[PDB]
Design a protein around this ligand. Sequence first.
Ligand code: DPJ
Ligand code: CO
Ligand code: FE2
Length: 328
Amino acid sequence: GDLINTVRGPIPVSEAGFTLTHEHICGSSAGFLRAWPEFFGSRKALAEKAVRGLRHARAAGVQTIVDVSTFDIGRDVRLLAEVSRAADVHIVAATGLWFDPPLSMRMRSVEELTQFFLREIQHGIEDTGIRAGIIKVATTGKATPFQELVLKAAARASLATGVPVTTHTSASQRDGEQQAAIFESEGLSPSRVCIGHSDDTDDLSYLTGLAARGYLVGLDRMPYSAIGLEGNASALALFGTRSWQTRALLIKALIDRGYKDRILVSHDWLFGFSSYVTNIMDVMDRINPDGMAFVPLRVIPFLREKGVPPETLAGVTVANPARFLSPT
Ligand SMILES: CCOP(O)(=S)OCC
Ligand SMILES: [Co+2]
Ligand SMILES: [Fe+2]
């Protein structure tokens, strides 16, 4: 019945299966992979790395990932389609804007941004015909004036298409509350919205407050920890000093408080990464060699061993993403 758009075209919602709802093939910038593919070794090396990673995830039971790279994360939909085909894993692509918009975006009005997001959802990204299945937005603290427009434009595009909205927050600053206020001012249903990087905080007052309102809570940085790397300032700043087990306990905490239907789980992983320090990808691959298999291989058994029922784990990893992604 319900369909969702992937980089290989439409798929039935029921085929999405075990779905990681916040991932990247490559975290980069608009135009960068085209202008400087050698940064990644080569485009071919990048694609091969991504195919090996997604095949590993697939072997662990992952059937679909949502690549939340926007235009300004340097999303390359042809790359996503190539690797999706080679690895046989569905990929849902994104529209929206993250927190590195260039001037040609920052100068735009809410109307103009709505038109852009609609173009990528309804017509296709660039000249490819590949349609976005989610809208990615971001704040890092209080929203900038431009970020206010972006969140309103995302709400309007979601209302028009039924495609969900997913967010980057600075979770320690509780950005989700302001994001929610902006979304609701536009009349967007909280069930269409995932407040992301919510596992970057242990503030369950903040998290249950959102979940109580109907928001999905993105616990989407599972493998991130610089424990043991504290001498590496850049890894420390990006990864944090909380263990993956600490992050994973949040999933249990929300399930134990009645919020099992409001949780989405992912890694925020990537196979190339040019928007941060050089060789950050080598540090990450050492910390988490399992890549996007880490959730099914480590997180889901950890939870099962803590007594979370399999039905509940299936509801979190299959039913929740399905309900979220289904245009509504
Ligand atoms: C660690 C990854 O965080 P981000 O997806 S906000 O960076 C862009 C790839
Ligand atoms: Co983010
Ligand atoms: Fe991300």
